[PDB]
Amino acid sequence: KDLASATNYVEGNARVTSGDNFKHVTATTTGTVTVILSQALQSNDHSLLETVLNNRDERVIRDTIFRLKPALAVILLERLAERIARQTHRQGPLNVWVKWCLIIHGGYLVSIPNLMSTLSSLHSTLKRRSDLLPRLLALDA
Amino acid sequence: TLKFANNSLLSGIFLQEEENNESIVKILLGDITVPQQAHLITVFTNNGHVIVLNYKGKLVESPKHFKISLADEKLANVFHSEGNYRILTTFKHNSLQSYRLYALTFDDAKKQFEVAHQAEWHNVILSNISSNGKLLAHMCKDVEHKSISVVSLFDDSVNLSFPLGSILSSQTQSLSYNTRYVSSMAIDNMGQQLAVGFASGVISIVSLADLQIRLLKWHIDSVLSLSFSHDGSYLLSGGWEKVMSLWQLETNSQQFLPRLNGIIIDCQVLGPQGNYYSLILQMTENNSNSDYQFLLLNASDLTSKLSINGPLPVFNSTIKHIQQPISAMNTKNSNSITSLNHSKKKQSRKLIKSRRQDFTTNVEINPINKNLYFPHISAVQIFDFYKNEQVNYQYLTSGVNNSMGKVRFELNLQDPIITDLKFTKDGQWMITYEIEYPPNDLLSSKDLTHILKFWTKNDNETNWNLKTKVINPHGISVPITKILPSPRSVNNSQGCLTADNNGGLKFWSFDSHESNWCLKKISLPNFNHFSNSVSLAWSQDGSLIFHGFDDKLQILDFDTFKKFESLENTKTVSEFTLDSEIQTVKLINDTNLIVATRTTLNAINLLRGQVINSFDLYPFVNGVYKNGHMDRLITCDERTGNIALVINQQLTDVPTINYKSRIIIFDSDLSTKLGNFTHHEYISWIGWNYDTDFIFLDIESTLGVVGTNSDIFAEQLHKLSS
Amino acid sequence: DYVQVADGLMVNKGNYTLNVITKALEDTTDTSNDHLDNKAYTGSDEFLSQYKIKAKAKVMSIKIDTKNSLVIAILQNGLIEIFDFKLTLLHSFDISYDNLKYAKWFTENGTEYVFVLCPLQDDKVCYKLLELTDCGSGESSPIKELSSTIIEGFSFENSKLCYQFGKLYKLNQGKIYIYSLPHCQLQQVIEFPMVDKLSPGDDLISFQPVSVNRVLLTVNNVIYLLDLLHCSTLSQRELTHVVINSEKSHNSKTIAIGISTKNGPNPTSSLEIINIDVGTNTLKDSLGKSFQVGNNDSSVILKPLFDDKDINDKRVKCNDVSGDSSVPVLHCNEVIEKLSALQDNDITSFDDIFFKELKIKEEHYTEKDRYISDPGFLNKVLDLIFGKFPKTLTFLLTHPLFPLSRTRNLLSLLRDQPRLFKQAIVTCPNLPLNELLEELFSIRNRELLLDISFRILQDFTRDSIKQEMKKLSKLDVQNFIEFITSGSTQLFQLLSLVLDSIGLFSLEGALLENLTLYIDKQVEIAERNTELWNLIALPTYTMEYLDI
Amino acid sequence: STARPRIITSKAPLLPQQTTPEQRYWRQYTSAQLVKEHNSVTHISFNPQHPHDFAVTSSTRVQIFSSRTRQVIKTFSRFKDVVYSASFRSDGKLLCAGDATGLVSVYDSYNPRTILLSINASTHPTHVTKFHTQDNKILATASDDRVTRLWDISNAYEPQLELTGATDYVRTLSFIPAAPHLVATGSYDGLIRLYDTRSSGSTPIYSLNHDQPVENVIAVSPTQIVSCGGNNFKVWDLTSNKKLYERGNFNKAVTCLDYVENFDSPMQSALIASSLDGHVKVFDPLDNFQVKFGWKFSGPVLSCAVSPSTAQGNRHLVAGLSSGLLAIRTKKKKSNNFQRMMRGSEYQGDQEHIIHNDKVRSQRRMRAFERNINQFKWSEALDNAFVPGMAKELTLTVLQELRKRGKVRVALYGRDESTLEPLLNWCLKGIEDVRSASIVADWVAVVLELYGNTLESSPVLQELMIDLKTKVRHEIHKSKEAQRIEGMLQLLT
RNA sequence: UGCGAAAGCAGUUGAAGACAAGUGGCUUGUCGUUCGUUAAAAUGGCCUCGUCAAACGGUGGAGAGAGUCGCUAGGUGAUCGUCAGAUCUGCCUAGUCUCUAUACAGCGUGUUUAAUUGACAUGGGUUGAUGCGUA
């Protein structure tokens, strides 16, 4: 090609990222589903993770997360964050799970030393969901 | 390269600190002194000196120069034919010039050229001369309107004239002024036809014997340049689209050449058979300077044989009687048919009266191969200064920069501005930051995008590859005031530190595992005040970072990335409130650091934790630079000192359009002014190349530097076989 | 250039050992050791010893005795080894070697015949160097470095008995000519205030620096370029800096002339014969952040005033960018004399202090930028008005409008005049957030709440607000929520800050439901006026009329 | 002059859980085959040499499948009890099978009728039989006799070495892949013993205490070996006798392992693990045995294998389940007068001094929207956006190119009811996504700015505007509640 | 236009002269005219140099598509009916379940961290659109 011809712009396979991925630093309760959820999260079992969080009764979700062990509430929250990042219609039903994980395990993940670095994907997903709120405010006006 | 300032032979013609209207106006190939014997050129300047210069071998140390007996006239051009020589001159009502043609002779006393005065034209609007130089056309403004007159100059073969209302259509008199304004004209080597290019976009070939016209409509914006071929059967035209068209005048058939990195402000055929086209490309994405690229190209395959260009910086403001060229609408890249006079009056008044006379730019030096990278608008000119020719040119944003010649409305769109770029200290990566602007008259027209890109090349290839880009670093709509590359001790010189106008900092670094440049460290404060008077510095050890926000120089560490702390409280002063917002925090070496703010210039030691020296800046740099540009005005070294740099706009007996530069150096914490230099022109950027020199960029872009039997048979055979 | 300053034989062991340091003793029989226990046998003792070392075995120990030779000891087992005499004059500083590293038969008198670490292995006779008063052993390529008071430097390598280099080093009577921490140099201290580093590969000075103050017992630490130095008649062992992977914190070197300062670690209490107390407990020299602490060996501050770029035909200054003036006529002598003109009998009046300050600094009396000023000068005139004399109407208005006020601002709540207090809220450019939060939560229910919330938001980071607004009671925050709900943008985000910083659980319910209802209607009105701001042909048959 | 820059497809910031190269490669193992066996598939080995066939050990038969048709080419049915192990020799020439009566029978592969020799091992069931990987003429059989045996296949009467020492149920052998004297055996008491065969052989030289009862031990390097048993697997440096990684990423016991090297893959090595709960997972030995991909199967997976390192054809992952069936997932791969007349067209300049090259490279074909943006047909470019078969990022990038480049209004000028309905009917779908909704916002804003009268006239885009209103209502409830979650974890810092 | 932060905060928009049109003046409008102020349109758009097919290597994906009326949560309709509720085995959406050449998109394989080969005489002539129906 010519020597005076400028180089065109080409991204190629450059990784486009945002500025918000901080990935670097007797019974009497119900019949819940938390053994299913716990041995979904001990492995990486997307299939039975989907069969445990297609349950959407609020008291079942509530005491399920209450009976959950708090050392893996952070990875339940990571799985929920990645699923609502990918599928956008899940944000309605699945963020009921993410608000209950914060309310119940409000001590474990305030005692964790790097909250944003450990659940970066939630922060990036909610930042990109709520960043454009003035724009669709102007749109619906 | 015949350097003018190399010798007093013709630097005595011009070395002035105030007067650069002495200009070089024509070059001829022969020798006007003695005929019939050529390997040397005779240059006519715009005042009346005629220098004869040998460009084969070493330049002679006494050229054959003369000075023609001239009136107040100022030398439009000279003309050559067989044997004879003409010259044309300009004059002193409505502001129009006035032209006057002489003929030359030389022979009797070999110091003076005698002149003859053929004729005059008492008001000239526009002019052109044919390719052979045998005839010339021009415009008149003689009443209801203008007029058009063609005249052969080396003979009275033909001289005709007519009002151009007989050229113009009947539709144009009830249409806009662009339809009757004419921005170009050309004649062929016979004077049979003439091309009138109008500001509306059309061209019209009139046939001069009978004044019948033919319209050629392709240019959707103003026609800026026209030329004929030698036989007159092809018309080259160029305009605001960056497309050179050539019209086959038999069938009216265009051949195009579409993406010519600048608008064609002049085009002409060049060879005896017409095998070259020479073009001038105005490159009008920056409105702050008129930077022309000279490009001839062979006519066979239309490839750019020998494109020529100077360095292309973009200054923060317009420079010196710079007028962006004519067009159809008044845009942010051009001006309409009305506003050229008002714009030049306003620009002269702005250079006289106003206060923010800062037109300073950022230039970078690639620390591997010592070539300097002028970031143009949405592009970079990589340019090496040991031969002062451009390495290449590369588009670094995603605009409509290259894909399209923008026209009358579309010139109100701007491609994203590259405002920062810095190399990592081993020269392996190039960090760049750009502001992507939205088009007007829609919902998202008032939120910018801020994009930080990371480029890589090996040491052979001339162009960089984007490895990653982060859109909105630091958050949405927030700028990056300063990026700083990191020293060789953090991630093997593969980290960058970006600063907000919130005082937030982000440390980005390239790790090989996830093979990308990712976000490592973060310190965000959430204030409610913003200021772009942000500066940054790093310790060479890689231990502590000096975050010079406005009025406040915080001291952060690197391990926990918060403000510095020792529990023993050994007068751990980790903030230095100064009298004004600080714009340079340049640390010369690990002992001390020079702060520069808009009143004073302090220096602070850290092995003796207090102020050591101070200087007064307010009488020199008061409210004249934008806050954040003292960092490009002053610089440092790694051993041998620090360089301040001030500017005095000169005065009459009010300020003027003339400038002088006062650069000063200091060694070893502001001790001695061991360099006090004065340069004849405004100075725009100074920076230390990595081998103990400091390069600076003049406002007219001269880069300067502050440093430390058989013999006769052989001769006759090389004659007779060449 | 100091370090963290406090604390007013096998050379690489520590504690949990028995005695890896057996050393000689002043005014005693020969030698001793102690534990935190190994036996103290004899290495053919009772001579004129001045130091004592071992072969890095502690049961092949010795007593380095001034008899031209030395033998082995049995400090663990009971079985001795044989020896062989070389000289008979003075071997008081004998240092037995490792497995063939650095050994020669140099006793005291220029007879450095090379040998090995054995009782009968020999080498060449490398006694060529002159009478050296400072012979040390380093590990460049294990080498005897001789500095001679015939003055000349030489360096022989006891790896092939090869004289590497040598020159004429004019070294006088020294204090400690100790080898460097990386061994590449020689730190030789001059007597009172100086310590020069010389190149110990070519015998030439590389950096001759002065020191801070009096120091006598100086030796290079196990650092990059740092030394330790104890005072002569002082127990003060300070540190200075002119191993790099995971450096030392204690047990670095034992050469000191304090009150029996043997076996000097960081916690240097349990000595080898002394049984003393301990001191500092820091590590060696770091890269560059500890030199902001140890900012010593320079204490020469003067009164730095703003100079000017020197007037070399300054009359061609070419359109100066000021308003009307060109240069302020600097009077630092009048700046100092204004102190005497102010510290007078204007004990309640503004006739001899405020007029004095506004005459010395001809300004608009609320504005900066006609500066020529020093922070010590402003602090001393602020002290002279904080003495016998806030009733001045010009001086203490024009100098909280100065960015160098230096922390005499704490009584700004403790004095309460309305206009001076609001001006010290808005413009005083260094304020303590403790007093700012106290003034914020000591509410007088006015617009100065907005003026104090403005500054507390616009000059402190949010987490530094949160950590120091944890330091509040609960009646303050309950009345703050009550006053916000009663009766704006910066106080909304301040309310966000108080909710983030009160904590998680320990709240009440009625205040929470009241705040919930209030901010529900607040979001509703914010939504509707955001909507308001974002809110800012022919038929087939007609019938018409015309003029008659 | 330059060439024209291509229209860059709008890529947003990347979302979490992107497609890694490892999981793209391991996800193109597809077209699953399910073959119902008579009983649980206990072992599966591959042919080493022409690595293109594999033997599946069901109950009382061993079937060799081909790696190009996936049908049973050959079968071995003349066992008396349940056949347990079946492996090929390192030359791939013959096939050993341990049987529940303790009768090792070795046939030759690809000939089920010629049983070559029947070693009568212990009276207990022989559960693992494999040849040496360096040597050819020795066969190691461990049985439920708590003693393994090395047999020379010439002298098949007494075992040439008898490796005893284990307290319970030796179920696995392994050989160390550079030292051929080194046999690592693994039993149901934990305790990977390993033996130097030049010594006595009744005592291991050392023992590695996997705490769970091991199910398999394989050798990865000449130095490190991996033992699975219980819910985890551990890796052991063998020159230093010392554990250095352990991954417990399963629910139930890891039944088997195998390992791949140097094959055509982004992963330079791969250890896959099969674990009685349905899962088979692949772990990358170069970044610390991190899991990269996995398959879930319809029952507890008892054994697994992949095609060997030099497969050169159709490549296989096979997993045999305890349910009694077998799952295969593969990745696949004019006249002499006229020629004498047109001879030279394949020469390419070998003996020729100068070789000129200015044939330009043929670039990718331009799509219709890209050539219409090139031809400045901006309304036609919008029309080419809203065809049905267009990718969502392609509609987004032509909207963004018309937004940045020229004029939304130019692209929308000559429209009416029938030619706006594609745009708004796509804007319904694009208003949900984050990456599109800014562009959807300003395009809808411009079209209602300059078509507010067609709003009055046509009722059949009024309803489209109403549906768009309820869409922005749902999206604004979502963008408000996301800010509420953002605040409610900003509280927890 | 100035100060600014990317928000915003203060300032506006005169005079002379000439010319054109309309009805020597009067009105209106222009200016390749000057002084002062910090101050939309002339049917008129971008070149050839070789395409097609099949791979391969990284990069993104809202995945490209097809089912099961299988589950979870919903939004809603026709007719009758006092409602209760009936039939339409009511419809639509999202998630889940199942499957495919990851079907989708993009950059590259001339040297690159990586990754490419093959077809074709890259012509001329005659019909080819009034010859066509599966709608």
Long-range contacts of D93-101 (CB under 8 A, 24+ apart): D93/D49, D95/D55, D95/D62, D95/D64, D96/D129, D96/D130, D96/D131, D96/D139, D96/D141, D97/D57, D97/D62, D97/D129, D98/D126, D98/D127, D98/D128, D98/D129, D98/D141, D98/D143, D99/D125, D99/D126, D100/D125, D100/D126, D101/D125
- Rounded to 5°, the CA angle B423-B425-B426 comes to 100
Cα-Cα-Cα-Cα torsion C385, C387, C392, C394, nearest 10 degrees, comes to: 10
Helix (H, G, I), strand (E, B) or coil at B418: strand
Nearest alpha carbon to residue B556 among B546, B566, B567: B546
Distance of CA B266 to the CA centre of its chain: 17
Please report the number of interchain residue pairs, chain B to chain D, with beta-carbon separation below 8 angstroms.
Answer: 46
Nearest residue of chain B to residue A21 (CA atoms): B519
Cβ B86 vs Cβ B101: under 8 Å: yes
Q: Which one of D2, D5, D408 has the shortest CB-CB distance to B442?
A: D408
Long-range contacts of C29-37 (CB under 8 A, 24+ apart): C30/C63, C30/C65, C31/C63, C32/C272, C32/C273, C33/C272, C33/C273, C34/C270, C34/C271, C34/C272, C34/C273, C34/C275, C35/C270, C36/C270
DSSP B415: P
Q: How many CB atoms lie within 10 A of CB C475?
A: 9
b/e sequence B146-169, b meaning 16+ C-beta within 10 Å: bbbbbbebbeeeeeeeeebeebbe
Cβ C49 vs Cβ C64: under 8 Å: yes
Q: Which chains touch D (3 or more CB pairs under 8 A)?
A: A, B, C
**Residue B141: nearest nucleotide (C-alpha to C1'):** E32
Q: How many CB atoms lie within 10 A of CB B239?
A: 29
φ, ψ (nearest 5 deg) of residue A86: -75, -65
Cβ C153 vs Cβ C160: under 8 Å: no
Cβ D307 vs Cβ D285: under 8 Å: no
What CA–CA distances, in Å, run from D271 to B26, D29, D281, D294, D317?
78, 16, 8, 12, 12
A8 CA → E63 C1’, Å: 30
Nearest alpha carbon to residue C241 among C267, C214, C218: C218
Place of tokens 């074909």: D365
Q: Distance between CA B624 and CA B645 in Å, rounded?
A: 13
Q: Which one of B611, B651, B673 has the shortest CB-CB distance to C304?
A: B611
Rg (CA), chain C: 38
Maximal CA-CA distance, chain D = 101
Both tokens assigned to C232 = 């002569």
Both tokens assigned to C30 = 């020969």
* Sequence-distant (≥ 6) Cβ neighbours of residue B144 within 8 angstroms: B165
Q: Distance between CA C241 and CA C254 in Å, rounded?
A: 18
Q: Length of chain B, please?
A: 722
* Sequence-distant (≥ 6) Cβ neighbours of residue D285 within 8 angstroms: D220, D259, D269, D270, D271
DSSP for C442-502?
S---STHHHHHHHHHHHSS-HHHHHHHHSS--SHHHHHHHHHHHH--HHHHHHHHHHHHHH
Residue C340: enclosing H or E segment and its boundaries? Answer: helix C332-342
What CA–CA distances, in Å, run from C22 to C41, C221, C251, C283?
10, 20, 14, 25
Cβ B197 vs Cβ B236: under 8 Å: no
Rg (CA), chain A: 20
Q: Length of chain C, please?
A: 548
What CA–CA distances, in Å, run from B360 to B645, B651, C265, D125?
12, 21, 58, 89
What CA–CA distances, in Å, run from B23 to B19, B48, B104, B115, B254?
10, 10, 21, 21, 37
Distance of CA D40 to the CA centre of its chain: 24
Q: Distance between CA B334 and CA B327 in Å, rounded?
A: 6
**Pairwise CB contact (< 8 Å): C291 & B606:** yes
* Sequence-distant (≥ 6) Cβ neighbours of residue B254 within 8 angstroms: B218, B245, B246, B247, B248
Cβ D276 vs Cβ D300: under 8 Å: yes
Q: Are strands B127-129 and B119-124 parallel, antiparallel or unpaired?
A: unpaired
Q: Which of residues 278-307 of B touch strand E (CB under 7 A)?
A: 302
Q: Distance between CA D203 and CA D211 in Å, rounded?
A: 20
Q: Distance between CA B109 and CA B435 in Å, rounded?
A: 65
Both tokens assigned to A64 = 């399920």
Distance of CA D72 to the CA centre of its chain: 24
Q: Are strands C132-138 and B611-616 parallel, antiparallel or unpaired?
A: unpaired
Both tokens assigned to C320 = 């100066």
Helix (H, G, I), strand (E, B) or coil at B128: strand
DSSP for D289-357?
TEEEEEEE-SS-EEEEEE--TT--SSEEEEEEETTSEEEEEEE----HHHHHHTTTTT--SSS-S----
Query: Tell me, what amino acid is at A140?
Result: D
The three-state DSSP-derived secondary structure of C435-451 is HHHHHHCCCCCCCHHHH
Place of tokens 């960015």: C403
Query: Tell me, what amino acid is at D426?
Result: W
Place of tokens 């000891």: C73
Task: Kindly give the interhelix angle for C332-342 and C375-386, rounded to the nearest 10 degrees.
Answer: 10
Query: Tell me, what amino acid is at B9?
Result: L
Mutation site, C210, C292, C431, interface B, largest B CB count within 10 A: C292
Give the resolution to one decimal, in Å: 3.7
* Sequence-distant (≥ 6) Cβ neighbours of residue D97 within 8 angstroms: D57, D62, D76, D79, D83, D84, D85, D86, D104, D105, D106, D107, D129
Q: Distance between CA B494 and CA D100 in Å, rounded?
A: 63
Both tokens assigned to C281 = 């407990």
Helix (H, G, I), strand (E, B) or coil at A122: helix
Expressed in percent and rounded to 5, the helix, strand and coil fractions of chain A are 60, 5, 40
What method was applied to determine this entry?
Answer: cryo-EM
Cβ B5 vs Cβ B27: under 8 Å: no
* Sequence-distant (≥ 6) Cβ neighbours of residue A13 within 8 angstroms: none
CB-count burial class (<10 Å; 0-12, 13-18, 19+) for D390: middle
Chain D positions touching A130 (Cβ under 8 A) are: 479-480, 482-483, 486
Nearest alpha carbon to residue D395 among D76, D3, D10: D10
| Phi and psi based region of residue C164 (left: phi greater than 0; alpha: psi -120 to 50; beta: remaining) | alpha
Cβ D228 vs Cβ D257: under 8 Å: yes
| Phi and psi based region of residue B283 (left: phi greater than 0; alpha: psi -120 to 50; beta: remaining) | left
- Rounded to 5°, the CA angle C273-C279-C284 comes to 105
Q: Distance between CA D475 and CA D470 in Å, rounded?
A: 9
Cβ B79 vs Cβ B153: under 8 Å: yes
Chain D positions touching B400 (Cβ under 8 A) are: 404-405
Q: Distance between CA B91 and CA B99 in Å, rounded?
A: 6
b/e sequence B198-224, b meaning 16+ C-beta within 10 Å: bbbbbbbbbebeeeeeeebebbbbbbb
In sequence order, the β-bridge partners of residue B689 are B693
Q: How many helices (H) and strands (E) does chain D have?
A: 10, 28
Both tokens assigned to B554 = 């915080």
CB-count burial class (<10 Å; 0-12, 13-18, 19+) for B243: buried
Cβ D476 vs Cβ A140: under 8 Å: yes
**Residue D362: nearest nucleotide (C-alpha to C1'):** E50
Cβ C375 vs Cβ C406: under 8 Å: yes
Q: Which of residues 107-136 of D touch strand E (CB under 7 A)?
A: none
φ, ψ (nearest 5 deg) of residue C321: -100, 20
b/e sequence B400-429, b meaning 16+ C-beta within 10 Å: bbbbbbbbbebbbbbbbbbbbbbbbbebbb
Both tokens assigned to B323 = 């007028």
Mutation site, C500, C512, C516, interface D, largest D CB count within 10 A: C500
Q: Distance between CA D19 and CA D28 in Å, rounded?
A: 12
DSSP D15: P
- Rounded to 5°, the CA angle B217-B223-B229 comes to 80
Q: Distance between CA B675 and CA B696 in Å, rounded?
A: 15
Q: Length of chain D, please?
A: 493
Q: Distance between CA D444 and CA D461 in Å, rounded?
A: 12
Nearest alpha carbon to residue B202 among B165, B248, B169: B169
Q: Distance between CA C421 and CA C416 in Å, rounded?
A: 6
Maximal CA-CA distance, chain B = 99
Q: How many CB atoms lie within 10 A of CB C210?
A: 12
DSSP B571: S
In sequence order, the β-bridge partners of residue B579 are none
Cβ D168 vs Cβ D146: under 8 Å: yes
Q: Distance between CA C155 and CA C152 in Å, rounded?
A: 10
Q: Distance between CA C336 and CA C333 in Å, rounded?
A: 5
Residue C535: enclosing H or E segment and its boundaries? Answer: helix C510-535
CB-count burial class (<10 Å; 0-12, 13-18, 19+) for C520: exposed
* Sequence-distant (≥ 6) Cβ neighbours of residue B567 within 8 angstroms: none
Maximal CA-CA distance, chain A = 84
What CA–CA distances, in Å, run from D254 to B211, C13, D227, D269?
97, 48, 10, 19
Q: Distance between CA B360 and CA B628 in Å, rounded?
A: 11
Cβ B292 vs Cβ B282: under 8 Å: yes
Long-range contacts of B609-613 (CB under 8 A, 24+ apart): B609/B571, B609/B573, B609/C292, B609/C295, B610/C301, B611/C304, B612/B669, B612/B670, B612/C304, B613/B669, B613/B670, B613/B671, B613/C304, B613/C307
Q: Which one of A106, A107, A137 has the shortest CB-CB distance to C534?
A: A137
* Sequence-distant (≥ 6) Cβ neighbours of residue B616 within 8 angstroms: B599, B600, B601, C306, C307, C308, C309
Cβ B604 vs Cβ B575: under 8 Å: no
Q: Which residue stretches of B110-161 are H helix?
A: none
φ, ψ (nearest 5 deg) of residue D421: -50, -35
Q: Distance between CA B470 and CA B498 in Å, rounded?
A: 12
Q: How many CB atoms lie within 10 A of CB B513?
A: 7
Q: Distance between CA A6 and CA B103 in Å, rounded?
A: 45
What CA–CA distances, in Å, run from D308 to D53, D173, D227?
10, 19, 20
**Distance (Å) from the alpha carbon of B303 to chain D's nearest alpha carbon:** 7
Nearest residue of chain A to residue C532 (CA atoms): A141
Query: Tell me, what amino acid is at B302?
Result: L
- Reported as half-sphere exposure (CB side, CA atoms, 13 A), residue D337 has a value of 0
Q: Distance between CA B384 and CA B389 in Å, rounded?
A: 6
Cβ C263 vs Cβ C269: under 8 Å: no
In sequence order, the β-bridge partners of residue B187 are B194
Cα(first)–Cα(last) distance of chain B, in Å?
Answer: 25
CB-count burial class (<10 Å; 0-12, 13-18, 19+) for C46: exposed
Q: Length of chain A, please?
A: 141
